[PDB]
Structure 1
Amino acid sequence: MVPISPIETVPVKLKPGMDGPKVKQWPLTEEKIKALVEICTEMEKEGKISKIGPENPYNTPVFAIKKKDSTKWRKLVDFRELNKRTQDFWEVQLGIPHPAGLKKKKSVTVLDVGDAYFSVPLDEDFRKYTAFTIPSINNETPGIRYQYNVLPQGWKGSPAIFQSSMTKILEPFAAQNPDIVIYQYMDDLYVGSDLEIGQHRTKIEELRQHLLRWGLTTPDKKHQKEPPFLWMGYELHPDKWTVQPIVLPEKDSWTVNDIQKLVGKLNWASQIYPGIKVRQLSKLLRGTKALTEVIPLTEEAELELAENREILKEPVHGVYYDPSKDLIAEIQKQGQGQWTYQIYQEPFKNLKTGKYARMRGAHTNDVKQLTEAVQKITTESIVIWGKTPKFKLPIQKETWETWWTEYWQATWIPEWEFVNTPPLVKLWYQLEKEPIVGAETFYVDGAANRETKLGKAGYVTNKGRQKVVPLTNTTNQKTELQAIYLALQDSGLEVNIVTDSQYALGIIQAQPDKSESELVNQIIEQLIKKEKVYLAWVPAHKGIGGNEQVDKLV
């Protein structure tokens, strides 16, 4: 007898003000009972459970379920009530590693623990709260009582305690073996090293003995799992990673759930397969509650999907992260508020890829979207590699300079360089900060009757030029935008425009290159065509001379 160290139990409480589960034990068939009695018998023999007396008020229902209609039966206990009534644990399964963040190893091995798991004892004072009863045959006898001495399978607090304990155990062995690396997921431990393979095998052996010291049984034979590993949607080789292969379904009738699963597969494959376009398909899913309704593929969706299936034609591999080399992210504009990025170390070997869709605004510009994408990639890169990448961006230094210097908001991008890979991101117009000498002065106004939705838009100038246009089915904001649009249409290459609209000014100081409103876009095109434009504001109804409320208030 070589002594094994005890595993410290984790104190557990029920949610305050509440108590444990009470549920009437469901009647079974004689068969199910006869199976469960044997199962619980040998479990009791192994120490996973124990027989208890009538003193325990708590009963959780126990079910029998045949395993694949074989000669074996298996126990299934429904803990949902206890889980509802049990406290919260800090769940350290928060997040999972991303393969791109890992460093390659010459050797990697899996150690399954389905043994050590039940070597982890439950808190003694909490044991009475897990209690199940096996109904005897015919109910002619008092049912058999049982309680858990270890972490039950499917209890709310099992994973956290399991992982905390396991970590506590692995702690010094990791510390005194700095030349290897370990990661724990579910029932599997993952060890890796750059050691010569024999040394690796003996290291794994040493780990197995180390777990044996706490009385944790390890397979004692060769493990059936070797690289590649299928893990959480990934195919993991020691020198490379990818996603478990993505194949786009060919169907004539595309339903809502079809495009749901399609955007799932695409958003999942986007991290590696570069240039995946989710836009048109996602737009077809907007506002659709019913999963059974077939929604016709737009002609903009088909040629997108045709590029998608030509992306997934031949698979591509991601590499691992080498801390000795620079970290770089490159961005491209795909148009339509979509951006595609690739994070790599050496050219054309990508650590990973990705995409960014614009936030939903009324208006927006390229530069803002580029900035937002940069922030996204930054945060992602801090999560994964722990540092901020070097950016290669489709924007001239000068453009960025003008933008951030003149922009009303504070804005920043980390260290970056201009890559010339069209389409380039640019500023489409720039408003003068001073009134233009020699340029005609257009005083514009618009107004609308709120009751009849009728109104007018127009302008008067210093050169005598005037216009007023009637508008039906329109609003004050609309008429006041239309006024400016008119002043832009009818004016030469340089123009000064006075407006009383805080709204129009509010829109134009946001410098959008695109908008939901075709009117605003028309104005944008107009500005783009212009040489110099000075937009000036005055308060309404203060009788500012030249601002004419009399023509459009009729």
Structure 2
Amino acid sequence: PISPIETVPVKLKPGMDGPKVKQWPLTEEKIKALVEICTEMEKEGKISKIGPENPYNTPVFAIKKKDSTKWRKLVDFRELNKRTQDFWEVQLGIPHPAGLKKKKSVTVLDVGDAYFSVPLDEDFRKYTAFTIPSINNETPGIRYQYNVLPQGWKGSPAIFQSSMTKILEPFAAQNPDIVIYQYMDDLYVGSDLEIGQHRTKIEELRQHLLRWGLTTPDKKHQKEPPFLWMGYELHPDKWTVQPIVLPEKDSWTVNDIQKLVGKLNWASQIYPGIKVRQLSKLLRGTKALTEVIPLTEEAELELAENREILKEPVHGVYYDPSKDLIAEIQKQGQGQWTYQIYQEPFKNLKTGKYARMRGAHTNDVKQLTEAVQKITTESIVIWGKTPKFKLPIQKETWETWWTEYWQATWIPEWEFVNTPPLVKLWYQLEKEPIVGAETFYVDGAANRETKLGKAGYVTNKGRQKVVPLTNTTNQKTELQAIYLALQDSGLEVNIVTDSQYALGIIQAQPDKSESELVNQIIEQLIKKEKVYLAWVPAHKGIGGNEQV
């Protein structure tokens, strides 16, 4: 049989037993349809009839496919799968085309009857036992078991991949002018060899595999570029995404919105400028998978922009190790960032976008840093080096920022590209208090029940103000106090606040938020020349005038 391939030893999960499920049922119309399959599988040595000796057992169902000339046997291994040991996880992610090297020729070989071509560990086989019944009347049910990897069995993919990998080594040893990538039941071979000897080599590999019991395309030899693979279009000199289709609807489903943002973020690999923000903000509600969700003007505008970019196709190229790797980032402005990875000006390996969905308040430089981080990781995964960066930020700007920042930040080799909207910090608080500046002592408070509260200040010039607030919180009033001090002061101002929160926001130097209060505070801070924010403990009775 298929014995030459060395079996992989398999244990059941410790402290368990094989599946004992008995099958009497059910229908006689599909029984003699099952026998037709089982006899031909038995003759092919894939399954073997087992006897009276009281083995285990598993349910077996029969079903059909359209164009009924093809019958289907489906064995349910779920229980056994519960009871079998864990295996090394099969390859999770898939190789990204931007990391592939251009080869003079590429061939695709799928192996048919894959799992059934790899033997199953002998001692384990008894646990794969199953029964085909008859209708009563002193007839013992037909008992079989698998000699090979059962379709749907837990350990089948990993053991198969292991076996293929092994079988490939006596070949790849004799031929390292040719590179073989392995994915599932597919082998992707490529070479810079002359086309004739490339073809010859391919056929050699074919006869090798066939000698080991692995079938492979004969009629044809099949796929010629493209090469529609895993949602891609692979062309000899270029790669792109499988065509993207955005549906048009009067009423949008949260499900369809998930499919939408999915197709869009998928499209973002290559088409530059894709914005998922508003459409995803729609999905921010985590409730009710069937709920009909309306749109927003910003959302529909965004979808329109996406349709406009998607209208005209752009293509990605393949990787050249001799050429440097460059990543370039541009700010979209809504908290969204875009980037392209290229060794060439008019050709991109790929593109992508980074958005900060964490929390609310974060500034431009930190966001740029995080983007550089994501790009660095992605580049390590796809290529194995890190790119040189082209960033829209002045040297002195980033230097000042990282030197002033409480967290340790690191960026690799990078240079300043002059393309606006250049990233900058709009205001820098004073390191030391300002002489000849009005000193505002600010405070704010709220009743967490009534939710009214108030915000105000008292200056050293004897100037005082108290502004009533409605529908707010202590934090809101506390920012409102600083804002109030900003409105009523001159170009140079000293503010003193009792709260760690407000000081925390202000010192953080954010340039934007969804909080309009903080936005206006920012605008004030920009309009100001010198602002010194200082902190003191509350209720310590020093400079603070509070109330209740």
Identify the TM-score tier after normalising by the shorter chain.
over 0.9
How far the C-alpha of 1:475 sits from its partner, in A, is: 3.2
* Residue 331 (structure 2) aligns with: 333
The whole-number CA distance in structure 1 between the counterparts of 2:252 and 2:543 is 62
Q: Which is worse superposed, 86-95 or 33-42?
A: 86-95
Between the aligned partners of 2:26 and 2:477, the Cα distance in structure 1 is: 76
Q: Is the 8 A contact 2:251 2:292 kept in 1?
A: yes
- Would the aligned equivalents of 1:363 and 1:512 in 2 still touch at CA under 8 Å? yes
Q: CA deviation at 1:5?
A: 8.2
Report the CA distance between 1:177 and its aligned residue: 1.6
Most deviating of 398-407 and 475-484: 475-484
CA separation of 1:268/1:140 partners in 2, compared to 1, >3 Å: closer, same or farther? farther
Q: Provide runs of 4+ in structure 1 moved above 6 Å.
A: none
Instruction: Choose 388-397 or 157-166, whichever is displaced more.
Output: 388-397
Which is further off, 290-299 or 406-415? Answer: 290-299
Deviation of the 1:419 alpha carbon = 1.4
- Where 1:486 maps in the other structure, the secondary structure is helix
Provide the rounded CA distance (Å) in 2 between the counterparts of 1:355 and 1:402.
26
State which drifts further: 294-303 or 350-359.
294-303
Measured after TM superposition, the shift of residue 455 of structure 1 is 3.3
CA pair 305-479 structure 1, distance change in 2 beyond 3 A: closer
Separation in structure 2 between the aligned mates of residue 224 and residue 477 of structure 1, nearest angstrom: 67
Q: 1:222 deviation in Å?
A: 3.4
- C-alpha distance in structure 1 between counterparts of 2:150 and 2:364, whole Å: 54
TM-score by length of 2: 0.95
Q: Could you tell me how far 1:507 is from its partner in structure 2?
A: 1.6
Q: Is 1:447 aligned to 2:445, yes or no?
A: yes
For 1:60 and 1:9, the matched residues in 2 are separated by 22
* 1:390 Cα offset (Å): 1.2
Alignment of 1:194-343 (within 5 A): 194-343=192-341
C-alpha change, 1:163 and 1:451, in structure 2 (3 Å) is closer
Residues 126 and 497 of structure 1: CA distance in aligned 2, closer, same or farther (over 3 Å): same
How many residue pairs end up in the alignment?
548
User: What is the distance in 2 between the residues matched to 1:315 and 1:543?
Assistant: 67
Q: Deviations over 1:387-426 (max 9, x none)?
A: 1111111211121111111112211211111112222211
Alpha carbons of 1:116 and 1:69: their partners in 2 closer, same or farther (altered >3 Å)?
A: closer
**CA distance change for structure 1 residues 26 and 227 in 2, over 3 Å: closer, same or farther?**
farther
- Partners of 1:217 and 1:297 in 2: CA distance: 52
Distance 1:218 1:471, change over 3 A: closer
Tell me if the contact between 1:443 and 1:548 (Cα under 8 Å) persists in the aligned partners: no
User: 1:445-504 CA distances to partner (integer Å, 9 max, x unpaired)?
Assistant: 223345544433222222222222233444332222221111111111111111221121
Query: Taking every aligned residue pair, what percent have the same amino acid on both sides?
Result: 100
Tell me how far 1:172 sits from its aligned partner: 3.5
Answering whether residue 351 of structure 2 is matched by residue 353 of structure 1, we say yes
Query: Cα deviation per residue 1:126-185 (whole Å; 9 max; x = unaligned)?
Result: 100001111124554111000000001111100000001111111232233221110112
Q: SS where residue 460 of structure 1 aligns? A: strand
Write out per-residue CA displacement over residues 313-349 of structure 1, whole angstroms, 9 at most, x where no aligned residue: 1221110000010111111111221111111110121
CA distance in 1, matches of 2:395, 2:123: 66
Contact 1:63 1:77 in 2 (8 A): yes
Change (3 A) 1:26 1:529: farther
Closer/same/farther in 2, CA of residues 26 and 335 from structure 1, 3 Å limit: farther
CA separation of 1:467 and 1:238: change in aligned 2, threshold 3 A: same
Whole-angstrom CA distance in 2 between matches of 1:255 and 1:356: 25
What are the equivalent positions in structure 2 for 1:534-553 lying under 5 Å apart? 534-545=532-543, 547=545
The CA distance in 2 between the partners of 1:39 and 1:51, in whole Å, is 13
- Structure 1 residues 547 and 433 mapped into 2: Cα distance closer, same or farther (>3 Å)? farther
| Deviation for aligned residue 1:117 | 3.9
**Structure 2: distance between partners of 1:72 and 1:375:** 52
- Flag the 1:374–1:160 CA change in 2: closer, same or farther, 3 A: same
Instruction: State the secondary structure of the residue aligned to 2:374.
Output: helix
1:149 aligned to 143, 147, 150, which one? 147
**Which whole-Å CA distance do the structure 2 matches of 1:161 and 1:5 have between them?**
15
Match of 1:30, SS?
coil
Counterpart CA distance in 2 for 1:88 and 1:200 is 40
Out of 503-512 and 137-146, give the one that drifted further: 137-146
User: Would the aligned equivalents of 1:381 and 1:387 in 2 still touch at CA under 8 Å?
Assistant: yes
CA displacement, residues 36-87 of structure 1 (integer Å, 9 cap, x when unaligned): 1121001100000000012233111111112324233221111111111111
How much does 1:26 deviate? 5.0
Contact map agreement 1:455 1:479 (CA 8 A) in 2: yes
SS in structure 2 at match of 1:133: strand
In 1: Cα distance, 2:344 partner to 2:355 partner = 26
Match of 1:378 in 2: 376
Whether the 8 Å CA contact 2:112–2:214 is kept in 1: the answer is no
Counterpart contact for 1:7–1:121, Cα < 8 Å = yes
Deviation, structure 1 residue 221: 4.5
Once the two structures are superposed, residues 220-259 of structure 1 have per-residue CA deviations (whole angstroms, 9 ceiling, x without a partner) of 4431222211211111122221111112112222222221
Task: Give the direction of change, closer, same or farther, for the CA distance of 1:517–1:93 in structure 2 (3 Å limit).
Answer: same
1:6-52 alpha-carbon deviations (Å, 9 max, x no partner): 21111111111221212221523323111111210011000000000
Cα deviation, residue 535, structure 1: 0.8
Q: What secondary structure sits across from 1:203 in the alignment?
A: helix
Alpha-carbon contact 1:393-1:417 (below 8 Å) kept? yes
Superposed CA RMSD in Å reads 2.0
Cα distance in 2, alignment partners of residues 475 and 297 from structure 1: 30
TM-score, normalization by structure 1: 0.94
**Native 8 Å contact 1:4 1:213 kept in 2:** no
Aligned to 2:468: 470
Greater CA drift, 211-220 or 8-17: 211-220
Structure 2 unaligned blocks of 5 or more = none
Contact kept? 2:2, 2:117, Cα under 8 Å: no
SS in 1 for 2:29: helix
User: Within 2, Cα distance between the matches of 1:139 and 1:329?
Assistant: 75
Whole-Å Cα distance in 1 between the matches of residues 446 and 302 of structure 2? Answer: 43
**Structure 1: runs of 5 or more not aligned:** none
Change (3 A) 1:375 1:201: same
Cross-structure match for 1:102: 100
Deviates more, 1:332-341 or 1:372-381: 332-341
Aligned to 1:409: 407
Tell me, yes or no, if the aligned pair for 2:98 and 2:318 is still in contact at 8 Å. yes
- Per mean C-alpha deviation after superposition, the further-off stretch among 333-342 and 172-181 is 172-181
Deviations 1:81-128 (A, max 9, x none): 111111111113222101110011111112221255433111111100
1:110 and 1:189 in contact (8 A); partners too: yes
Say whether the 8 Å CA contact 2:115–2:150 is kept in structure 1: no
Whether the 8 Å CA contact 2:538–2:544 is kept in 1: the answer is no
Q: 1:422 to 1:145 in 2, by over 3 A?
A: same
